Subunit: 313 residues, 3 copies
Amino acid sequence: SRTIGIIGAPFSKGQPRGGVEEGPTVLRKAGLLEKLKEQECDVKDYGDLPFADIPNDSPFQIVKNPRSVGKASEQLAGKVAEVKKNGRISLVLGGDHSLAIGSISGHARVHPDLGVIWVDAHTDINTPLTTTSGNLHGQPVSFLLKELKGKIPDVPGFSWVTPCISAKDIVYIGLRDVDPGEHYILKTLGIKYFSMTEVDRLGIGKVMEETLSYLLGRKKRPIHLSFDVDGLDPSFTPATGTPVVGGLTYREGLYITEEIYKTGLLSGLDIMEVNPSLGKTPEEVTRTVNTAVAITLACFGLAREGNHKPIDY
Amino acid sequence: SRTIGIIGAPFSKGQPRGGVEEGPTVLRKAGLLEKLKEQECDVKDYGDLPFADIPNDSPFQIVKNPRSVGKASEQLAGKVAEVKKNGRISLVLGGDHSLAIGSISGHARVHPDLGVIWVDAHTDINTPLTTTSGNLHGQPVSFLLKELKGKIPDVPGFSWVTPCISAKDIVYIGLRDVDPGEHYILKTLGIKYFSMTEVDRLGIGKVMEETLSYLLGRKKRPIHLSFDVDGLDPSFTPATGTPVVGGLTYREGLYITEEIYKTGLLSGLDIMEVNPSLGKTPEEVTRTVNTAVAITLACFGLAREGNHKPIDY
Amino acid sequence: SRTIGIIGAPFSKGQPRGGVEEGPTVLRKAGLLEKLKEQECDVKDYGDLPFADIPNDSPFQIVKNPRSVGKASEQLAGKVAEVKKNGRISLVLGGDHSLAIGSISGHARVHPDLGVIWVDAHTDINTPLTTTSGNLHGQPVSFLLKELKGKIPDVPGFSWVTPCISAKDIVYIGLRDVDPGEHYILKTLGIKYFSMTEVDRLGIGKVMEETLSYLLGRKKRPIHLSFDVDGLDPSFTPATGTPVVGGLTYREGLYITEEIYKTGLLSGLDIMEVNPSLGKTPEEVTRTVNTAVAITLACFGLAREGNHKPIDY
Ligand SMILES: N[C@@H](CCCC[B-](O)(O)O)C(=O)O
Ligand SMILES: N[C@@H](CCCC[B-](O)(O)O)C(=O)O
Ligand SMILES: N[C@@H](CCCC[B-](O)(O)O)C(=O)O
Ligand SMILES: [Zn+2]
Ligand SMILES: [Zn+2]
Ligand SMILES: [Zn+2]
Ligand SMILES: [Zn+2]
Ligand SMILES: [Zn+2]
Ligand SMILES: [Zn+2]
Ligand SMILES: [Zn+2]
Ligand SMILES: [Zn+2]
Ligand SMILES: [Zn+2]
Ligand SMILES: [Zn+2]
Ligand SMILES: [Zn+2]
Ligand SMILES: [Zn+2]
Ligand SMILES: [Zn+2]
Ligand SMILES: [Zn+2]
Ligand SMILES: [Zn+2]
């Protein structure tokens, strides 16, 4: 049926603030598994990946914690590939977005033809040479693009990496805080994106129609959804590291996911950047987690119009 | 002209929390009548219906306060039918939504051909046999549907009831918290609804165009609007019993009503679920009431673009 | 390139509450100039206009501080005309909206064929004879309309005024609190407007397309944008004198301005009604100013999708 495989990934060295390691814990203790089991979902939790501490991981130029991040993704890519072989949609509950490198890589090992939908207020496509922060949660995409392969230096811990996607297989939704170098890359590789500008102009309805018509226009390949919690407006998911105002509405958030689910092609999912310790109040924490959970459930069947199990009431 | 007849209905036994009995009081003391008189409106207040206490009203299966609710609606249906004969649009300031049974029944006694628009985060169409709460504010619609007549047991106090509407004469707007049994009924009787999903996809503009094209496609019959205050997002109407996040915008709220008014067919109106005691702060209370009032005024002429009385300024 | 000329106008006698005189100060101390210089913008600040105190300025009928306001606008019109001759887009950081009279008048002295976009929750088109408040921040438009010339009494201090625009050269966006006399004028002179009703119905996308198709349908004349901070919903710009609920979204706010900029015709800009002292909290103050700044930057190039300077990264 709608089989899922849960991958907790308590990692945070992809950026400065540490609380995101707890993301898996809080979402789990929010009742996610239970809630998913309450749907036609066949759920199997593969546990929280144990991330060995790499004490010796000095900066690579300005790129911070490279070996730590590379291993974290290298380990995850393998676990992802495992559940995908067990015929389950991989659900990655993580910390920072840098894990996307491991998530998508391993997912591709199984389904190379996959298409990606990246919901985020940022493009996370900086390169070790374009980034000015050195924080890897803002560079995952660059490591995954084939077009870029050959303009990215060998970063300690990323030798295991192989560019599993071309510009033509990814769509962004939500952008509102993009770097100049990031912008240049977009227009140059002609990447499909819908910034808040396009959403405002078109409506989330058209936005979703086009994005899917874009990725599934030709063949009907498996879908990977990388959802960075900061894609939604801070008034919904405040407990996040890099929030930007003017974000996606809670309703738009649900609309995106309700539509992905209805395609029947959701192969992989990432719920990133949920940092409970950045909530200025116990409720901002609750609010953030709750939304993260609601969005996840929509990915797996939950519909605002209602749902009904096969029987005469 | 635009003649109104005010019906205060301080009832609450349609659900557990009691504060909704005060709804009429707070809205009145908010200046509603005055404000309506300030428009081209001819206003007549029929007073707050006195609801006899039914001390002996044990549960019917799991259905709570059946005799209390049935009488409350039985009395109201008669008062509604009275003002409709006095050629005035009935305005029902109430408590819980279970009163809809009395409101619509009596309205129909006068205008049997009426169509209904139900703004609510819920469908309130459970049956004594489908409800799991037993609270009647979530079952009014089931008692009014002809298609369902014959699948509803005789509930103490509802013998006076007669199904005055078919599936084809009602439209829902706002749904986002629907029960499985409720969902089955929708798809089965093919009821027209626009959940938050449809609103997100289409926009309130198209939503309103379709809903009216649906109800007034054929003849031009009188319109009944049942507005459950919880249809709007909690950030607008927090002082309500059953709030759900991801609701209708304040602007969408006004858009709905501004459009109904412009049809010139508004025959009956219900402003339900305003419970002032559920506001966590004196202002949430104020906010909730204010919105309830603003929406009501839009139903009777108030336009955001402005209004002008027939004369050269 | 994209040359700007900054005009600070610390005036407030266009309405009762005084804090708006500080608007220039707070926006400047928010880093505006710096931020604009950070873009392809060529910025020149002409300083804060010194507004002589007119101790003797008794009411004209009910019109308050007429001589004070007339001089303030008379002085500004001249400064505006100065920067427009220095080939720079005039940026007017002001106090109350009554300054629009001086801003647009002087802008026209240079570019008579200009078209105006007025973002505001009000039309500010009352006349000394229609206004019931007597506050001039709600009458600037009336003084600028040719069609009205001959139905406006000579107000002390406004002799220097000459109606530099006809009904056909202005578009309103955001209206939601319009006076009856104001409404009569609209329908009578057939002025193009998009109240919140139209925005709700059409979407900001269509709204912007139509408004520009309206003003630039024929020739391609310079554009004047009068942005009253209260056009946006109070949840964004609370520190304002006359706020009204159900306003423009922050995203819609940016959409409007991003679109104006992209036309390449922005000739003049007004950022009015930012009163820091009306913020119930230090953050409402911060929030309000921040939004005012973000909107201004969008007028001058800033795009949510990102920007890139001419070079290979
Ligand atoms: N563009 C910034 C912020 C990136 C934010 C990363 B993300 O999307 O995972 O939050 C940077 O490169 O440091
Ligand atoms: N579906 C729930 C909630 C109904 C809410 C009723 B209403 O719409 O009036 O608030 C129930 O049957 O108990
Ligand atoms: N219509 C009211 C309010 C006008 C508000 C002026 B404004 O738009 O500048 O805030 C009046 O004439 O006093
Ligand atoms: Zn495959
Ligand atoms: Zn992000
Ligand atoms: Zn991040
Ligand atoms: Zn370029
Ligand atoms: Zn990200
Ligand atoms: Zn009739
Ligand atoms: Zn409800
Ligand atoms: Zn209720
Ligand atoms: Zn079915
Ligand atoms: Zn209801
Ligand atoms: Zn010109
Ligand atoms: Zn205004
Ligand atoms: Zn003002
Ligand atoms: Zn008229
Ligand atoms: Zn104004």
